[PDB]
Amino acid sequence: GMELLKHLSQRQYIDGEWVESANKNTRDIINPYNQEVIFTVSEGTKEDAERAILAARRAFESGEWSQETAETRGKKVRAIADKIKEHREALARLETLDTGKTLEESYADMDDIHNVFMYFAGLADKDGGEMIDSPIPDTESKIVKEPVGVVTQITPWNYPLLQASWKIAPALATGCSLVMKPSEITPLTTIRVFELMEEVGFPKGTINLILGAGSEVGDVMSGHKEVDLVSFTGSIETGKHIMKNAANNVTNIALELGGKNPNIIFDDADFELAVDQALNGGYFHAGQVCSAGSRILVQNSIKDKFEQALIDRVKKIKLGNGFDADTEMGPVISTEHRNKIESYMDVAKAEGATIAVGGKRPDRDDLKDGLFFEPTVITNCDTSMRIVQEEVFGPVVTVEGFETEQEAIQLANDSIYGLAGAVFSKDIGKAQRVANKLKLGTVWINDFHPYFAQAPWGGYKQSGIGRELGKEGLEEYLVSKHILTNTNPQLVNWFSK
Amino acid sequence: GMELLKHLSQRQYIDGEWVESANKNTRDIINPYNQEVIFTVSEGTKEDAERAILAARRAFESGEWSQETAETRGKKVRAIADKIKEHREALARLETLDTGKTLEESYADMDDIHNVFMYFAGLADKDGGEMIDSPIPDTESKIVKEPVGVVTQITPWNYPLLQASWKIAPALATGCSLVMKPSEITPLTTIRVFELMEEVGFPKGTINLILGAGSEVGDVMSGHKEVDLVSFTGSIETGKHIMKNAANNVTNIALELGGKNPNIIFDDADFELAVDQALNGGYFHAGQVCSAGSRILVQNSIKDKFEQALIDRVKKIKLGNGFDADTEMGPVISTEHRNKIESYMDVAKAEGATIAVGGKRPDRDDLKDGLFFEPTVITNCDTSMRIVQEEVFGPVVTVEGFETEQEAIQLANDSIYGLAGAVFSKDIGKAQRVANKLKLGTVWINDFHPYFAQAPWGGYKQSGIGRELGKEGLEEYLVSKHILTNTNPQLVNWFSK
Amino acid sequence: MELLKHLSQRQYIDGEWVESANKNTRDIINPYNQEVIFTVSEGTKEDAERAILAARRAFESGEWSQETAETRGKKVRAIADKIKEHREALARLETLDTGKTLEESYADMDDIHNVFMYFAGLADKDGGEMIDSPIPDTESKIVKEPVGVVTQITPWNYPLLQASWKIAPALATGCSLVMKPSEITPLTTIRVFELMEEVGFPKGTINLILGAGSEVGDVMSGHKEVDLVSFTGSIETGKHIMKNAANNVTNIALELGGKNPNIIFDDADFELAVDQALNGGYFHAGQVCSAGSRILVQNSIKDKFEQALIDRVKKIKLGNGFDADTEMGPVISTEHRNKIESYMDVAKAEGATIAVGGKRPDRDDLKDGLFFEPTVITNCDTSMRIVQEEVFGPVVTVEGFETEQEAIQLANDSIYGLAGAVFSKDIGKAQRVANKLKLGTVWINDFHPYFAQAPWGGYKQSGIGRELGKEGLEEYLVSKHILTNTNPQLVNWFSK
Amino acid sequence: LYFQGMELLKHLSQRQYIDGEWVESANKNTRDIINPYNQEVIFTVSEGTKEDAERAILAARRAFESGEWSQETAETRGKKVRAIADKIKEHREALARLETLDTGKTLEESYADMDDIHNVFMYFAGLADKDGGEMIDSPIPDTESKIVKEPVGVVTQITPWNYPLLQASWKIAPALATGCSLVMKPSEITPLTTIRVFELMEEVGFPKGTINLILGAGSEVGDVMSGHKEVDLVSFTGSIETGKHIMKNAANNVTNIALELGGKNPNIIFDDADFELAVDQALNGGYFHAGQVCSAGSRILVQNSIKDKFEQALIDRVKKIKLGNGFDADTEMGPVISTEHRNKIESYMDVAKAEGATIAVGGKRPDRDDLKDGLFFEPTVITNCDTSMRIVQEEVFGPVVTVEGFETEQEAIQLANDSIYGLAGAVFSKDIGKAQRVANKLKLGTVWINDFHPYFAQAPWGGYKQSGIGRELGKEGLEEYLVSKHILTNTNPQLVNWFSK
Ligand code: NA
Ligand code: NA
Ligand code: NA
Ligand code: NA
Ligand code: NA
Ligand code: NA
Question: Helices D192-204 & D164-178, crossing angle to 10 degrees?
Fold first, then answer.
């Protein structure tokens, strides 16, 4: 469906105007299902990014949005939520066109996105600070929460609009001015949400959209002196660089990098549930969702049976066009990403692991032109291997065995990451013991994947800094100010007269 | 009084043992009043720092402190507070010996320190997380707050034990394990507080003290993979380096880097109060306290009179030995710091400002051997000058005029810093308008200097990242985990059978 | 006429619009002309019992109480949207029923929308706490649940606004409710129940009882299946309700109005203070719960203030609330106008001066309605009954004071504690006074503001508990401490 | 005849404490305090008058209005509350012995109590300066909106005979931490530890009138404490009948009430419970403090497949419970509190019989020589009963348990909730998921999963339904002693011009 695109903007949005790149450069956007060019958009310059940042500062300083009532900001955020639902069908199709995920996955996404905006809309006017009981007589002490200021927001290619919603909603609810740059390879739904936000109506410069991967654009967004918070979701290497650049101005950072999310299955788990959720954990969005569970840890007494049950089902996963109802798994996002996955299979082999199923591009005629990769299970591996220690971010799972509860915890925590993970067991007490010991921002007990606006999401260790979603997510966009009034000021007379 | 030192430890404290440096290196500690060597301590190695970090990790993982009840942690933090009060006299004298500040200032410090530990002791068991209303039927969602983990803590020379208290108290209250390194030039009260903490009794490895050059062990304390939070208070250049190092492991950072704190005096201020508090803001601890007000902004109609009234009083400030009750202002901290202050006077002159009073080392016989510098007032300057834009951190103030409320706000915000500031005016409504527009973490209305454990302290912009003190200060030492239990788990059956 | 042509005339119990069990009815009056405008069911005590039992059944079924908080919020938001959609007709109905101006009713409907919206947004924002247990190997959590079955009795001043303050949190939290509006002003409440039915809630979640039938109030306050009784109205009725609630140790929330003081210092903005004294005294003919009937004015400006106030009072335009030029409508009922008249007799007997007003207006177009002239009473003091007792009408008293300390002492010399104002350009002084006033809401250089984001309620005899804000929501929740011992060991205290 | 235990009462005050002075009753009336172990008079104290209570209330109001305590910094109030806590620990031994002397409970139970009481004061000391209100994001442009929390004002506090000093600590600690002024009246039959804690509080030092102690059950004293116009909150713990009367009196001034009236606390034992744990905890639930603690579990609901075995195991152990002097280390259960209370328990056994229940064991006063003079009653198990009986529907507050069977999870929940009460209860099952389902459906302020009795200052305690109004302990408990004030400042006030000029 190209007609989606006939009225879609191809430009950046800076200081209230849809504008081309300063040098008129463009980029061709691809559909991963067939590798065909589907759209062409502006490829911005570092100067365009600077300009958007300066526009955001100007707007912030003008106070039109930062001084708007929180109730009114909430209404405007709610109007965005309603736009998302109104345009659910076209937004879902656009996300499927751009990212390759199934239309059913995109629908679920748009429902979630609506709920993200709705949550933050409702939160906007619920906490402006606190009154402090001052330990000094005849003083009044209060903490006032203000918008952090100017924020730069960089989003990834896995769930572009969802990740955008997680950043935009609190930023707008709190009164910040923002500059957003989506992944250079998946900008379509982000352009669309900016059109919608423009329709809702915000003061000029409050929201700005930069497009591309232009030289130093990232560096400007992370290193500009007028930025108060840089919020980045993406690769670990890029994130570290971003944090180093933010240091030059002592700028707050929020990072969500990925993680190797463990899926711990005890022998007293509901076996069929555990297999089902291992599949779901490994292969939803071809294993590219941030919540993906690529590291299965299964108790030794059920390991052999578990491995086979998993493989039996992996063999039946239906690959195809995300627009087709029968498709269960779409393609991976890009050539570069598929190549990384292929190199990892080589690593697995070199280390002596077994490719139990999958591990190559599918041959089928209707899959030949797209960026498909078979769902894969790697067995006979251990925590010392690169394939276990490094996240591939593809439709690939590893399987390790464990003997004891203590061992499962130790193995699961033997990782540089700390994003999310699950424990499966009918023994809820045991599951809760494991959950309390796992160094992960989210632990699921007898589930896999859930996240929602009402609860914070983020990582321990190298999976990130800070939180998105929930009240903690909103707090990344606020800054505290202690105003202390002396209501009966007297000279101190410490120095001589 | 060097009997204060006859049983003071000269060693580091690592994994429950007082130990020398791995290479037996030492450093001579000086009294700034007379530049005499007063004590010799171990000068630790980068391997000593690594060892302390590994000990903190081991202890953390053992759970003896991290899994102790919050109530019990609070009792132990309270026992520290009680030790501080019990040893108030000797601790105050030690701080005066090491830092040069007056004994009265040290006494006030020790009272404050007691109150910091007491506040956090009381906070320890007041919030373990929250229950979330899950949007998914048949699920329980909770957010549990855990200690962040292993923390490294680097403190400055201005208020060594105070700054230590701000970091140690929440770290211990929340169940973290810590490695602390005080300023290489002022370690004495920090050594002493470690002896006191050891007496209170903590599991081995919970607290560790490293001594010596930040240039040796700093990179390890900021860049080690087993650290979960690096908390640094000190110079801006060092802080940026520390944050860039922390990025290598995506490590949380908390920074307080000082600031050029404005003191805004309107023509309807209580005049005598404003002069008094300008003196206090400029010259308490020879202008070296983090709350110092070096940038005075005074309304033009009272400026000429204000300048003279300030100068009249500056001429009478009594410099001397901090142990002498008549002393109002002690020396500055070191040769290096005094040299920086002298270079700044040269800058002021080169830029065309006037040294209205002071601006040199005092001549008097009893002051000749110490690191004294005269309280100084610089006039005829403006916001474009280096002397206005750069913080000297000494007994020096600049005076700028302003015509309007709007101008005062614009000038005060024309700075890279954002730590604290004051507004003086009998028109409380106007003071509140100004306070709301100042980009500062603390604004005082008709006061100067107050800070206290009940309220968060920290900076906007280049003054820092995060907060110390208050509930927010405690929160730096916690991490959130969302535990989601599915209480009626069903297969999803997204994939084929 | 078409405004009422499709409006239900019945009660709403367990998902059905029903007549009274005895088919009794009550004629509803328009205070502007005293004409009967509508006829509705006058329920029985058995009807009230049946609604309470229906609410309990629904609560126990869990369809609403176990609905997700996010979904409950969407439903409460849908109510808010209905209010805005029907803003025009709802405003006209409130004016018809209560007599207040159409402009006042419009403002009301905008506010009511915002009340539902606020609570919709709050519904899913706090489910309880994790506690750091002092017992090793235990998990301690506090789960917040709906309080249960709630009865809600509302007054005649701002019927739909007061209904919104109660309904919004009750629904957001998952309670089941039984509401009874003032017998004399049920129209907008019937309408909002039609709208809520359209939004769609499980049968029994919401129920509407109409009337002042024998023992109906007593059933709503004294039934064993009720978990909270929330009442807004007169002090005498509130006390009776609390005594009845005691028979089952039932939570009560009460809002009983108050003598709200308006303190004007000589350094106030003078014209602002006169303007706001008028607004405080005479908005809704002085019948709004935020009304300021007790003016305390500093002696040095008192004479000038009194005359400025009187000059303006003489020009206040009385008339039909539907007419744009009307500034003040009639009072609510014959009984209420009679209470106001008896208070003027008291004022005279005590030796106060009726400086202006104090009687029914004569004008031809006003003759048939329940009008009472805006009134200013001067030369009075805190020892008088007129100053100690609130009349809740278009009447203000004026007392002088010399000092800040005296103003505070006078303002606190009252059984009430609902709201009040301080007018002064000296903000530090206004803040000192505000901190010392025993009132749930204090305005500095303003009069009347209230809003869903902040709690409203009274100290002393003005009430128990709060409505609006997070505290208001909390009246509809109950805390449960669930403590799990994760390594239970025998205690072995008793011998084996 | 002298013995070292006399040092315990020799210097203990016998008077009330009003407006900073230890004073006798206005009419010099006194009351004899008894030790329930031997029914001997152990001490004589003032029995105050209604005028004494009025005077204390007026003193509290005066003090509150003076602001010396209400305007003290929260930090400083916390230090003072902490000093009280430290006094409790310092005098732990004597306070425990005194509580055992006055109430009859074992010395080990009193020791545990004093540790708890210390922790209560410590918890509130720590809480005192942690929340002064909120800044509100105002929907009106050019306004500032804040909520300031103030002490509620003058509070009256009436405590029961079961855990006199513990219940006193639950009330005093938040009242002082928040800056209220208080008037406290302990149970007329158990005032000793309350007098002692007032001596200790006076040592710590508070402004005159901030704390006041009334003693007795004098005519209309209760009525003055619940119905006086100068009171802002009445907090009562005790019987349901008294609580209702108190609430009705509080209504005359529209006065806030906080009530804790006890309850019939269910102990639900599934067939997949740890059997020996469940029998152990059923004993603990039924018989700690002779079943007089407020957390007592008198209503056992046991799944039918293990009911017979459970009933016999319970009875086998009940036969071995050691009754005796609370001061003796071997004592497992002490006497009941008074003659009137023991009589109520005896009349309930008559009711049980009339209704057709079986007294499986106990049900009478013990015969043994060393128990003959005290207010002892045998630990009792009543079987073959059902939810329609008075003995199941009404709480006896003694060393008595009833045992009902149930077949299903749904049935257990239904039966457990078929009660006018709502204080606390337990679920025993190795199936934690099931226990959690049951816990969420029970209409009780506290639910224990595989435990019985725990309460602590960090978590609120209170009842649904007729067990009470409001909460004690935790942040919610502190909040009973605070009142909210919304201060709204218009920072750019403009005339409205609604009325014509
Ligand atoms: Na991290
Ligand atoms: Na300085
Ligand atoms: Na910063
Ligand atoms: Na009125
Ligand atoms: Na009240
Ligand atoms: Na109740």
Answer: 30
C135 contacts chain B (CB < 8 A): yes
Task: Please tell me the distance between residue B375's alpha carbon and the centre of ligand 3 in angstroms.
Answer: 30
The CA distance from D257 to D462, in Å, is: 13
Nearest to A260 by CA among A284, A287, A286: A287
**End-to-end Cα spacing for chain A:** 84
CB contact under 8 A, D126 and B74: yes
Q: Are D377 and D345 in contact (CB under 8 A)?
A: yes
Q: Are A161 and A173 in a shared domain?
A: yes
Q: Residue A191: which domain range?
A: 1-258+453-497
As a three-state string, the secondary structure of chain C is CHHHHCCCCCEEECCEEECCCCCCEEEEEECCCCEEEEEEECCCHHHHHHHHHHHHHHHHHCCCCCCCHHHHHHHHHHHHHHHHHCHHHHHHHHHHHHCCCHHHHHHHHHHHHHHHHHHHHHCCCCCEEEECCCCCCEEEEEEEEECCEEEEECCCCCHHHHHHHHHHHHHHHCCEEEEECCCCCCHHHHHHHHHHHHHCCCCCCEEECCCCCCCHHHHHHHCCCCCEEEEECCHHHHHHHHHHHHHHCCEEEEECCCCCEEEECCCCCHHHHHHHHHHHHHHHHHCCCCCCCEEEEEHHHHHHHHHHHHHHHCCCCECCCCCCCCCECCCCCHHHHHHHHHHHHHHHHCCCEEEECCCCCCCCCCCCCCCCCCEEEECCCCCCHHHHCCCCCCEEEEEEECCHHHHHHHHCCCCCCCEEEEECCCHHHHHHHHHHCCCCEEEECCCCCCCCCCCECCCHHHEECCECHHHHHHCCEEEEEEEEECCCCCCCCCCC
Determine, for residues C124 and A122 on separate chains, whether the beta-carbon distance falls below 8 Å: yes
Provide φ and ψ at A453, rounded to 5°: -55, -25
Q: How far does the CA of residue A483 sit from the closest CA of chain B (Å)?
A: 5
Same domain, C42 and C184: yes
Instruction: Provide the residue type at D142 as one letter.
Output: D
Q: Are residues A269 and A398 in the same domain?
A: yes
Listed by number, the residues of chain D in 292-351 with a beta carbon closer than 8 Å to a beta carbon of chain B are: none
Of B75, B126, B487, the CB nearest to D130: B126
A256 flagged as catalytic: yes
Within this chain, do residues A252 and A289 fall inside the same structural domain, yes or no?
A: no
3-state class (DSSP) for residue D69? coil
User: What is residue D371's DSSP assignment?
Assistant: T
Residue B16: both structure tokens together: 């429950």
Q: Are residues D37 and D112 in the same domain?
A: yes
Instruction: Give the β-pairing of A26-31 and A36-42.
Output: antiparallel
| Resolution of the experimentally solved model in angstroms | 1.9
Of D73, D131, D135, the CB nearest to A137: D73
Tell me the technique behind this structure. Answer: X-ray
Active-site annotation holder among A95, A290, A307, A476? A290
- CATH assignment of the domain containing B171: 3.40.605.10
Active site residue B290: yes
Q: Are residues D252 and D106 in the same domain?
A: yes
For residues A82 and A120, state if they share a domain: yes
- Give the residue numbers of C annotated as catalytic, written as ranges: 255, 289
The number of folded domains in chain B is 2
Do D397 and D421 fall into the same domain?
Answer: yes
Element (H, E) at D21: strand D21-23
CB pair distance less than 8 Å for B133 and C142: no
Report d(CA C463, CA C415) in Å as an integer.
Answer: 11
Question: A294: domain CATH number?
Answer: 3.40.309.10
Instruction: Name the residue of chain C whose CA is nearest to A433's CA.
Output: C486
Within the 361-390 window of chain D, which residues sit less than 8 Å (CB to CB) from chain C?
none
